[PDB]
Amino acid sequence: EEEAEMKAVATSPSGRFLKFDIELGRGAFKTVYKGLDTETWVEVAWCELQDRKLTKAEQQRFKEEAEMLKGLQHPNIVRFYDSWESILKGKKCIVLVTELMTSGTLKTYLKRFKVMKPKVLRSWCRQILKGLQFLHTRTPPIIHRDLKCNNIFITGPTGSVKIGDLGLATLMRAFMAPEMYEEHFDESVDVYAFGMCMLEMATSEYPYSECQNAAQIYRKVTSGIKPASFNKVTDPEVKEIIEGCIRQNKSERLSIRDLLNHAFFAE
Amino acid sequence: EAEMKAVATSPSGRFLKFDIELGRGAFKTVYKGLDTETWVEVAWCELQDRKLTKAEQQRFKEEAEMLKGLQHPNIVRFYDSWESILKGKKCIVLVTELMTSGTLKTYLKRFKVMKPKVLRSWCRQILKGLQFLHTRTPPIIHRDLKCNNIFITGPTGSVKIGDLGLATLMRTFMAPEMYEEHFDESVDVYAFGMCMLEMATSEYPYSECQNAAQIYRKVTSGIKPASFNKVTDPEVKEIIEGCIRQNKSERLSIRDLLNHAFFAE
């Protein structure tokens, strides 16, 4: 495609991708930079993360994750290209390289468009569900463990959506027995997440806004009191789905296929 | 000689609170009391509010009913409990057998080193206690075994596991299942190993690690404390290892430990 100079500041160990000193955004211990895939000439995302004092066992796990993730290709999963261990500044960093998303998250979308029309929520939600089923039906099944409106990215205002922030779950993680530090998850935790997401999209309100501190929310949730937002849901068919998803007893919650086999989500 | 200079009474009337403080912990305070039935003195633990839900209150109530029932030598007796407002805040009151002769922690502090004959006898006893709790029905898991909650009758006496209810009472947007705590018997087998190790080396395990996190890495990575290596008796050393195996299914069971030679006669 035409011609190009490099004038890049760093490159992937594979030599495939180049980093520019053009910072795109600055989150937690993350900093995203603009970059290029020499192979496709397509603009890409160079995520400088930080040191999460990665034990080591987990390092292996991350690598094993990376492989899978790189292999993944779906119309609704922000493609993962590559990752590696680097010493930027003075601290042991992990760098990730992914499909660059340019049109902001649902959240940014919500902050801008203020409210969301039925058609949108219907389509974009379906799109998310599709993505999830894809991840869950991977072999072995991959659990997001962290779906939120701000890591659901949109292709265009008029476009489609895709699930992002792919590995960050593992990456960003008295005396008691080790098995006490064990976090046990399953697919259904993603359904729970999804419902919460749908609700926020539907009400343009963050669930449990009412709450004032962390410990307060704990009570409400563990006691299965729904967020004040829930009541503010207008369409009763939506309300159905939201409820079914956020059911406190995990074994009573809906499944992905069930949501997709729902009427609202029928084509 | 059956006086009633008190400040408070149990709902049942059985127990009376004296206005004399025996200790002041985190969000708790212990005062002296009286089982007017047996006429024996007792500990009256005014706790504090633990931002409790309510479902858990029910659970705790059920737990506590189980507790009132228990009788074993190597367990502090538990008498009564109920909800109360002191000052402006909801508190939970606990009544238990009064232990005045301190803990393993206060014992190591005073005597500096533990004699191996003692260790053999007392550790034997802690195992006996845990076996009793684990064979309750439902099984009772401590979750929070430590040396400053293993009490002794006296320097020439024996051991009783305490801080019984505090596992549940003190604890130890995301789906509720994420708040669930996943413990089993081994969690206590693990915590016992730490108890035994402290006793063997008169050092608090992982005394080394200044940062709390430094400990996380080691534990999660499967690294035994510095003090582990300082265990001079090989038979003791093996037991501690078998207890603090990071793989939960690899750790010994209570039965295993009791069946072992070290713990015998």
Author numbering:
A (entry chain A): 130 to 302, 314 to 407
B (entry chain B): 132 to 303, 315 to 407
What does the paper say about this structure?
With No Lysine (WNK) kinases are soluble intracelluar serine–threonine kinases noted for their unique active site and their association with familial hyperkalemic hypertension (FHHt). WNKs are the chloride-inhibited protein kinases long anticipated to control the activity of cation chloride cotransporters in response to osmotic stress. WNKs are activated by osmotic stress in cells and are inhibited by chloride. A model for WNK regulation, then, is the presence of a dimer–monomer equilibrium: the dimer is inactive and binds inhibitory ligands; the monomer is autophosphorylation-competent.
WNK1/E388 (WNK3/E314) is noteworthy because it is on the Activation Loop that undergoes large conformational changes upon phosphorylation. Mutation of E314 in the Activation Loop of WNK3 (WNK3/E314Q and WNK3/E314A, and the homologous WNK1/E388A) enhanced the rate of autophosphorylation, and reduced chloride sensitivity. The high activity of the mutants WNK3/E314Q, WNK3/E314A, and WNK1/E388A suggests a loss of the CWN1-stabilized inhibitory conformation. To address whether conformational changes induced by the mutations correlate with the effects of PEG400, WNK3/SA/E314A and the corresponding WNK1/SA/E388A were crystalized. WNK3/SA/E314A crystallized, affording limited diffraction to 3.4 Å. WNK3/SA/E314A crystals were in space group P1, and adopts a unique dimer in which the Activation Loops are swapped. The significance of this domain swapping is unclear. Excluding the Activation Loops, comparisons of uWNK3/SA/E314A, uWNK1/SA, and uWNK1/SA/PEG400 show that uWNK3/SA/E314A is more similar to uWNK1/SA/PEG400 than uWNK1/SA (with r.m.s.d.’s of 0.7 versus 0.85, respectively). Furthermore, the orientations of the 3/10 helix and helix C most resemble WNK1/SA/PEG400. Crystallography of WNK3/E314A shows that it exhibits conformational differences at the same loci as observed by PEG400 applied to crystals of WNK1.
